[PDB]
């Protein structure tokens, strides 16, 4: 919902770390024209956890929605944006003709045509130059036969062609050798007291009677123990009140 999408030649790769990711909010945005995913199971995405989730957004031609793939081959593929051979993510695209309502077109949308196709994955070659078309370097500017700049997208035919623009949001889920922090949401049930229950406080499983305690912990304490290494107190998150754990009768 940025409402100001970038161009395909300069994509705005945003990094996500230590978040809930609310995987139920992605498909509630709008009907998607292309919802192709990859070696990360979308039905099981909410259960897994990753270290960094890289989000990438750009706009392409309607015929280029089938170009964002590992086994890709095309203009946008080799010259503008390339996915690796082993890509673990999804590609979400929807109709953008209604958003780019401008009969003039050619505004704020440009792409690449030449100059070292098969660009390395996730590397932004935004450096603007002129391709060496001919022997003369043309002093780094336009001139005779050196008419090879990065081209713009002519989104002029508003509601006039089937090659309408589509906004693509590429998600790159990566799990490095580090403690993963972008996990799924963790549900929590209502607290009960004065009864034997099978509790689980932030991963601390046990069985006993939960009662209010007069003991005061330090602000960083989330675990109460006694002699013989027994678990006699907890922090009880979502309320921050200290509870006493006594074994069931």
């Amino acid at each position: 919902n940025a409402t100001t999408f970038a161009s395909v030649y300069a994509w705005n790769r945003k990094r996500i770390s230590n978040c809930v990711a609310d995987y139920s909010v992605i498909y509630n945005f709008a009907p998607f024209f292309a919802f192709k995913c990859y070696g990360v199971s979308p039905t099981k995405l909410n259960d897994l956890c990753f270290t960094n989730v890289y989000a990438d957004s750009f706009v392409i031609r309607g015929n280029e929605v089938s170009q964002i793939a590992p086994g890709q081959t095309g203009n946008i593929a080799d010259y503008n944006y390339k996915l690796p051979d082993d890509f673990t993510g999804c590609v979400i695209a929807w109709n953008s003709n209604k958003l780019d309502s401008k009969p003039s077109g050619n505004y704020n949308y440009l792409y690449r045509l030449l100059r070292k196709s098969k660009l390395k994955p996730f590397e932004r070659d935004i450096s603007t130059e002129i391709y060496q078309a001919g022997n003369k370097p043309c002093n780094g500017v336009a001139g005779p036969n050196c008419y090879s700049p990065l081209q713009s997208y002519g989104f002029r035919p508003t509601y006039g062609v089937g090659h309408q623009p589509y906004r693509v949001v590429v998600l790159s889920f990566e799990l490095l050798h580090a403690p993963a922090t972008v996990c799924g949401p963790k549900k929590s049930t209502n607290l009960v007291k004065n009864k034997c229950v099978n509790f689980n406080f932030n991963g601390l499983t046990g069985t006993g009677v939960l009662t209010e305690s007069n003991k005061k912990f330090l602000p960083f304490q989330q675990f109460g123990r006694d002699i013989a290494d027994t678990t006699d107190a907890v922090r009880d998150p979502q309320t921050l009140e200290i509870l006493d754990i006594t074994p069931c009768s």
Epitope: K36, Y38, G39, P42, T43, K44, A69, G71, D85
Partner: antibody, heavy 119, light 109 residues
Framework: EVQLAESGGGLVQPGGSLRLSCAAS????????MHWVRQVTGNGLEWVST???????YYSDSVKGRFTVSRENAKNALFLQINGLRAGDTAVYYC?????????????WGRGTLVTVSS | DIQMTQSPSSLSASLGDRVTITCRAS??????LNWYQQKPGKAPKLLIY???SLQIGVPSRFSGSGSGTDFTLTISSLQPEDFATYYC??????????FGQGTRLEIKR
């Protein structure tokens, strides 16, 4: 035992509404994903649609836009509503379950149902 | 989008023979591939999943091999219950899953 039931396959006019049904038995239905795969007479298997544990739905290229898959956590009831059928949609549908793991594979298959669309 | 190319539609072999059903992919899919068996008189059933793991209940005569762009389902000794149709499926792009055209196993005489 463990098996998957099916019902609702039959003849329907082109473009008429149709709703298939699949009933599981023998396992925890609320913790496994379900898939729908068809097979045209003389052709191979063709994935139609699927629904995950979280209720999210997915369809194919020629399937999205006219199909509607649904699933209830209770009663082990699985459904697949279709609208706008055509002659090219005549195929043998199968109810399949998604096994555990990190990739889609059909570890359990149903009895299979036949669907024919003609006037 | 991903396409699969399996062995010819029919393979002729006798009892106890060795059959290596070959199925290739359009690009590198790693090990996200599974095999299935379908007798024309009943519903299909899986035999190999992940191209390396054998399904529980399947005899040890079936064996899956290959990865990336070429997969081969090798059978050591054909039995009367083995003659059926087989299909390979890629699982790299899970929403756009595609199946192979099929391969028939017939008795040689």
């Amino acid at each position: 035992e463990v098996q998957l039931a099916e019902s609702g396959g039959g003849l329907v006019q082109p473009g008429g509404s149709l709703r298939l049904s699949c009933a599981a038995s023998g396992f925890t239905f609320s913790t496994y994903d379900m898939h729908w795969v068809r097979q045209v007479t003389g052709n191979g298997l063709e994935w139609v649609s699927t629904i995950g544990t979280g209720g999210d739905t997915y369809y194919s290229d020629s399937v999205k836009g006219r199909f509607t898959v649904s699933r209830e956590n209770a009663k082990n009831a699985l459904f697949l509503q279709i609208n706008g059928l055509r002659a090219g949609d005549t195929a043998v549908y199968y109810c399949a379950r998604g096994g555990s793991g990190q990739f889609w594979y059909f570890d359990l298959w149903g009895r299979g149902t036949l669907v024919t669309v003609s006037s | 989008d991903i396409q699969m190319t399996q062995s010819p539609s029919s393979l002729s072999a006798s009892l106890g023979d060795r059959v290596t059903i070959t199925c290739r992919a359009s690009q590198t899919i790693g090990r996200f591939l599974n095999w299935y068996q379908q007798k024309p008189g009943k519903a299909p059933k899986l035999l190999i999943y992940g191209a390396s793991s054998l399904q529980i209940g399947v005899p040890s005569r079936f064996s899956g091999s290959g990865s990336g762009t070429d997969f081969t389902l090798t059978i050591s000794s054909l039995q009367p219950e083995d003659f059926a149709t087989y299909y390979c499926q890629q699982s790299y792009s899970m929403p756009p899953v595609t199946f192979g055209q099929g391969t028939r196993l017939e008795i040689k005489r």
